[PDB]
């Protein structure tokens, strides 16, 4: 009778992969409660002159639905 929902977010960062994920979670945190877990679905990114411009990490974020 616990139900969870998963939403698909993409985090981005110039710094690295961890930072990309943290960006997604940090935005999730602002409006969604009872965030429990995340799964990484894809890693992609953009390229510029210095190599990687932006890391982009597609993740599913699971959280418990409040009842009623």
């Amino acid at each position: 009778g616990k139900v969870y929902k998963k939403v698909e977010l993409v985090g981005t960062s110039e710094e690295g992969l961890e930072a990309a994920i943290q960006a997604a979670l940090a935005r999730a945190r602002k409006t969604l409660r009872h965030l429990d877990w995340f799964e990484v679905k894809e890693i992609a990114g953009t390229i510029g002159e210095a190599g990687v411009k932006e890391y982009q990490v597609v993740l599913e974020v699971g959280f418990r639905l409040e009842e009623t």
Copy 2:
């Protein structure tokens, strides 16, 4: 003309798989209208002393979007 949306839910139950799915659908039903179909994506669970503690079924629920 019709457009549907799919949301990803995870039902849980100590009783069985069917019970887990029904849990997800019961919760969806409280706030969503025109639920039409579901697809099971993963079946997993936690383990305790008596075996399966919790069945967890990841499912996509599809429903028809109302008009604007």
Copy 3:
């Protein structure tokens, strides 16, 4: 040696998953011989006012071909 064929069937039931599979196999059994094994490919279903209306299980049924 022997050759098998696999057919793709979808069983449905209001009772449960097992009942869905059994319904597919009970229909296969009516016309096909030497049914050996099955594989579940998808589980889906329809929704009504009581929750699950119909469980739908898509399976591949393997059977030995007669020469």
Copy 4:
């Protein structure tokens, strides 16, 4: 960095595949802002007396999340 969300929509149309996609995006457009890209996940459809009755295209639509 920026964060994006992906939602899973299913467009339908009697005309063709392109019209199915457009139907989804047209409905997205009514309530969502900063729609950026889409990915097609499945193509399916229903069958009637004249062949295809309805094309159905399951797509993920990605859009930029606004701040705060």
Copy 5:
């Protein structure tokens, strides 16, 4: 209690993707009854001098089994 079968067909057409699907369905329609839905599994094709010679769409066609 209803059971469906799925058959795997490949439609081809020089015109386009829709026309390839319709071709598969038209041929199905000739001999099969209670065709309900289809799923597209692959899109491929052959190449000639003017580009696409033939669109080829692999689809699964599902239909209700009589009894």
Copy 6:
């Protein structure tokens, strides 16, 4: 810090799917400690005169490794 191992087991049962999963876990539990979670990878089975003879559920069982 903590490291887990996953092992791939196949439970079987004539009764149903739940009973199959439990059979795997029950056998795991006899020799392995700190069983935490499982994932179902495939569902298959054998066919006899009465329909399903045996349900077979392939699962991955994860458990915490001791030091």
Copy 7:
């Protein structure tokens, strides 16, 4: 224009993989006309005292449908 059907067969042989495929095709050609191509989907087998007992190759066989 032309429409093909794919059927899923499993060829078996104690000799090897090629022989398993050939067994499937040989049986196909006994009742099916206009066999064009095949795809290998899985390779499996049984084990005995001398190693492999039986190679089993699951293949899709494609053939051109005739007109009524």
Copy 8:
């Protein structure tokens, strides 16, 4: 003992899917010889104010290697 190569190209077009595929093949055709077949791997696109801005079709193009 013929050998083929596959290259992965992405065609784009504002008009439709077919047009996107044709655009990739038209470019292929300029520099590559013995183009035989293609496979569509993904369909995606960009969104603008009028809906689809750009259809993008990722496809593998196969062609026979000369000696």
Copy 9:
């Protein structure tokens, strides 16, 4: 009732694919009992001056767990 385990092995051989599989099964046979079936998951290999140096077949081997 019965429970099986699957272990993931990689056979190698310079001779061919069959020989690669057999090498994995011959080694399994040394220490494991009640080997029943195998599934090939990947086929890969290394390249040398004469072409294929080593065929590598990744397979899951299934066997019945004793009481």
Copy 10:
């Protein structure tokens, strides 16, 4: 016939992804010999108040079997 075995491990770490992998491999190396290569299968993690609590990386580790 060299023969290799693959075992499926999950590494975890609060630091990052690299640290999670290294944890799995450090534990592997304590009891297993001739560790050759690894493949990452999934990246997931748990969420806490500061974002990522735990990175979890599922990997397959391949090693050469001795002989017996």
Copy 11:
């Protein structure tokens, strides 16, 4: 440090699977240097009156890029 490229080839042969792979590698080795490994992605073929006419093996060939 090192960077590799993978190209996708399709070998064909009337003889067997092994000969199909060897053909792709033999052609690779004429123009490409530092060929290291290969992965088989698909196995297919064409059918004629004696059964298999042509085995076709899709493989990725990996090789180390020079300076």
Copy 12:
């Protein structure tokens, strides 16, 4: 419209995952123009006495084709 090509590279590095990606892009950048995006397909590596010897990241690099 425009046409892009994707090429499949494998970047390696002893330092980490990011470094591996950057190595691939740095080598692409030497000879290819209009590099736009990348997709990570696999993460693997080799194992030595100190854990990870080499991180290996298989990625697809997309770039816009010039006009001929």
